[PDB]
C-alpha cells in the first residue's frame, strides 16, 4: 500500500513539487451522520446533494480529514512557501467561533481550523528562527460567501480582537454588507490587495472615471497607498464608461484581468509605477495602436512597408505564431533609434506582459526588443494569433 513515513523521508524540494501537483484537493470529492453532522455543513454541500454516497463518503472523510498528518505537512510547506502553493486561505464564520476555511477548485469546504490551533502547528513547528511570527499575512477576508447578518457579527469579533491586523487582502462582490466593511480597511494596516467582481461595483471603488467623492462609501485616502495589486474577474467591458484609469492608485504595480469579453488597451490609463499586466481567459483584446506612428516616421507606404520586415528564441518558440523583425539594413541607425523610441512611448513603465487564452487581436502586435529578448513576453495558447512584430 502507501506508508506516509516513507514519503516524509523525501527531500523538501521533492516533497514541494508533489504537493504542487496535488492542487490541494485532498478529499478528492467530485443516516445518523446526514441527520446531525450534515446540517452544519449543509450550506457548503448543497450543490452535491444529488449523490448520496458522495456526501456519505465525504462525511466519513470529514471526521479526521482536518486531523491528518499528510495534510498537516502541506500547510507546513505552504507557510515555508508563503501560501503560494494552493491558494488564498480565508476567514469564514460558522458554528460561532469563526474558524479558518480552505476551499478547493470545486469551491467546496475541505478543512477547518481555528486561529489558536492553526497558529500552533504551521507557525511554531515551521519557524526555526524568530523572524516575525505574527506576520501571517497570507490569510484573507471574503464577503461573497457571508450573509450580511454574519458579516457584521464576524467583524465585531475582529474589532474587539487583533485578527484584523493579520488580514492580507479583502474580497469585494447599496449592499449593507459592503458598506459595513468600508469603515474597516483603515485598521487593516497589512492590507495590500483588493479584488472585485461584477461590473456594477467596479466603478464605485476601483475606477476613477466618473468617480464621486463619497465619504464612507468609497475607499478612503490612507488605504489607497497600501494597495499594489488589483484583480478583476467576470466582466464584460472594463471601459464601460469609456475611460479607465488607475492614476490615484499610485502604488499599483500588477494588474490582473480575467474572464473579460472585450478589452481595449488604448482607453486604459496606467499609473507611474505600473510594471506588470497579466490577462487570462480574455475573449477580445485590442493592442496599443502603434503601427501608424511608425509609418509616419518611415514615410513609407504600408504595402511597401510589408516588404521591409524580414523573418535564442529556439528555447521558447511556439508554432501558433511567427516571429518577425524590422530590417536593420534598410533603416538608418538614427532612424532606427527613432523607431525604438516610438514603441517605448506606449510602453512607458511596463516590464511584464502575459497573454493566455485569447480569441482574437484586432491589430498588429508590437513589442520592444528589450522585453522580448528577456523572455518576458508570454504569448501562450494563442493559436488564433497570426503574427507578432518585434521592433
Amino acid at each position: 500500500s502507501f506508508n506516509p513515513v516513507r514519503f516524509l523521508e523525501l527531500p523538501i524540494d521533492i516533497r514541494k513539487e508533489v504537493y504542487f501537483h496535488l492542487d490541494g484537493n485532498f478529499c478528492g470529492a467530485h443516516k445518523k451522520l446526514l441527520r446531525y453532522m450534515y446540517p452544519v455543513f449543509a450550506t457548503y454541500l448543497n450543490i452535491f446533494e444529488y449523490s448520496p454516497q458522495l456526501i456519505e463518503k465525504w462525511l466519513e472523510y470529514a471526521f479526521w480529514l482536518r486531523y491528518d498528518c499528510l495534510v498537516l505537512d502541506c500547510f507546513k510547506v505552504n507557510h515555508l512557501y508563503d501560501g503560494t502553493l494552493i491558494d488564498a486561505l480565508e476567514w469564514t464564520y460558522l458554528d460561532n467561533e469563526l474558524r479558518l476555511a480552505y476551499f478547493n477548485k470545486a469551491s467546496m469546504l475541505e478543512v477547518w481550523y481555528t486561529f489558536k490551533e492553526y497558529k500552533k502547528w504551521v507557525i511554531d513547528s515551521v519557524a526555526f528562527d524568530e523572524l516575525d511570527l505574527l506576520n501571517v499575512s497570507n490569510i484573507q477576508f471574503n464577503i461573497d460567501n457571508l450573509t450580511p447578518q454574519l458579516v457584521d457579527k464576524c467583524l465585531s469579533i475582529l474589532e474587539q480582537k487583533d485578527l484584523f491586523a493579520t488580514i492580507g487582502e479583502v474580497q469585494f462582490g447599496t449592499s449593507i454588507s459592503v458598506i459595513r466593511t468600508i469603515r474597516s480597511m483603515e485598521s487593516m494596516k497589512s492590507l495590500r490587495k483588493i479584488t472585485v467582481r461584477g461590473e456594477k461595483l467596479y466603478e464605485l471603488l476601483i475606477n476613477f472615471h466618473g468617480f464621486r467623492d463619497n465619504p464612507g462609501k468609497t475607499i478612503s485616502y490612507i488605504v489607497k497607498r497600501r494597495i499594489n495589486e488589483i484583480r478583476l474577474s467576470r466582466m464584460n467591458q472594463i471601459s464601460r464608461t469609456g475611460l479607465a484609469d488607475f492614476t490615484r492608485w499610485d502604488n499599483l504595480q500588477k494588474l490582473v484581468l480575467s474572464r473579460v469579453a472585450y478589452i481595449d488597451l488604448n482607453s486604459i490609463v496606467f499609473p507611474k509605477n505600473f510594471k506588470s499586466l497579466t490577462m487570462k481567459r480574455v475573449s477580445k483584446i485590442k493592442w496599443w495602436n502603434i503601427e501608424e506612428n511608425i509609418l509616419k516616421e518611415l514615410k513609407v507606404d504600408k504595402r511597401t512597408f510589408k516588404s521591409l520586415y524580414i523573418k535564442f528564441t529556439k528555447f521558447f518558440n511556439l508554432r501558433h505564431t511567427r516571429i518577425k523583425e524590422l530590417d536593420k539594413s534598410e533603416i538608418n541607425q538614427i532612424t532606427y533609434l527613432r523607431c525604438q523610441a516610438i514603441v517605448w512611448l506606449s510602453f512607458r513603465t511596463l516590464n511584464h506582459i502575459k497573454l493566455q487564452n485569447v480569441s482574437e487581436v484586432f491589430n498588429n502586435i508590437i513589442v520592444p526588443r528589450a522585453l522580448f529578448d528577456s523572455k518576458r513576453v508570454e504569448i501562450y495558447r494563442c493559436e488564433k494569433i497570426s503574427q507578432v512584430l518585434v521592433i
Binding site: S1, F2, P4, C69
Partner: protein, 151 residues
C-alpha cells in the same frame, strides 16, 4: 560521435548526442568523446531514464513558464505502464530526474505519486494518524473523545 556517461555503479552507457538534449545538465558540460559521472543514480535505474527519453524524443513538451498548462496536462497512457514498477523505485526515478534536470520525466513521475494520495480509502486515514506521533499524548487522546460523540 556520441555522448557516453558513466553511472554510480561504474557501468558505461553510450547513447547519442541527441538523447542528451532532454537532460539540461549535459549542456553545461559541452561548452567547448566526453564523459559525465553520475554518482547518485544507480545503473539499473539509469537504464529506465535512458529508455524513457528515446520514446519522447519526438514529442514537444509545454514551456516551463506556463504553470496551469503543465498542471492540467493529463498523464499519458504509455507513460503510465512504464512508470509503475514499485513504490520505492518510483522515488529513485524521481530523484534521478532531478539530478539530470529532466523536467518532463519529473512531471510524469510525480503525477503517479500525486494520484496515490487520492486513492487511499477513508479507512486508511484512521490508522495513519498515529504513526507520526506529532500530537502530544494528552492532545492525541483529546482528539479521540469528540469523535464518538459525533459517532
Amino acid at each position: 560521435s556520441n555522448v557516453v556517461l558513466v553511472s554510480g555503479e561504474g557501468e558505461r552507457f553510450t547513447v547519442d548526442k541527441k538523447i542528451a538534449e532532454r537532460s539540461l545538465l549535459l549542456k553545461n558540460y559541452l561548452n567547448d568523446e566526453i564523459v559525465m559521472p553520475v554518482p547518485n543514480v544507480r545503473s539499473s535505474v539509469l537504464q529506465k531514464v535512458i529508455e524513457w527519453a528515446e520514446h519522447h524524443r519526438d514529442s514537444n513538451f509545454p514551456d516551463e513558464d506556463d504553470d496551469d498548462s503543465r498542471k492540467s496536462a493529463p498523464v499519458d497512457s504509455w507513460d503510465r505502464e512504464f512508470l509503475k514498477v514499485d513504490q520505492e523505485m518510483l522515488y529513485e526515478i524521481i530523484l534521478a530526474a532531478n539530478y539530470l534536470n529532466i523536467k518532463p520525466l519529473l512531471d510524469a513521475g510525480c503525477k503517479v505519486v500525486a494520484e496515490m494520495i487520492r486513492g487511499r480509502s477513508p479507512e486508511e486515514i484512521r490508522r495513519t494518524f498515529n504513526i507520526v506521533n506529532d500530537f502530544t499524548p494528552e492532545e492525541e487522546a483529546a482528539i479521540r473523545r469528540e469523535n464518538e460523540w459525533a459517532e
